[PDB]
């Protein structure tokens, strides 16, 4: 946990983070994106519950 705490402090791209880096750190990214396309739901739930969203309607 000490080492992990040090890892969060000394390494963290977060001003220029790439989704490619997250796809690399977890294949969960691509798995979920593919599962959503396969599911046929293009609204990922929870996204707008802790990020915004806007609409005209």
């Amino acid at each position: 946990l000490q080492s992990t705490l040090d890892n969060i402090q000394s390494a963290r791209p977060f001003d220029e983070l790439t989704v490619d880096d997250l796809t690399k750190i977890k294949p969960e990214i691509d798995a979920k994106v593919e599962e959503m396309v396969k599911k046929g739901k293009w609204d990922v739930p929870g996204y707008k519950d802790r990020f915004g969203n806007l609409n005209v309607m």
Binding site: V19, T23, I29, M36, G46, Y47, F51
Partner: protein, 48 residues
């Protein structure tokens, strides 16, 4: 009006329906899921 009437309608329509099929595939397979990557990634950071 002759600027709204060619007789080239089927010519027009060939290139037109080609653009529609192109964009349909292009959005659906390429450009829409790359926005969905941003969303899913954002939610994955949110969970962790």
């Amino acid at each position: 009006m002759p600027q709204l009437v060619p007789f080239y309608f089927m010519n027009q329509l060939t290139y037109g329906f080609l653009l529609m099929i192109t964009l349909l595939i292009l959005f659906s397979q390429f450009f829409l899921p790359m926005i969905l990557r941003l969303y899913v990634s954002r939610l994955f950071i949110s969970k962790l």
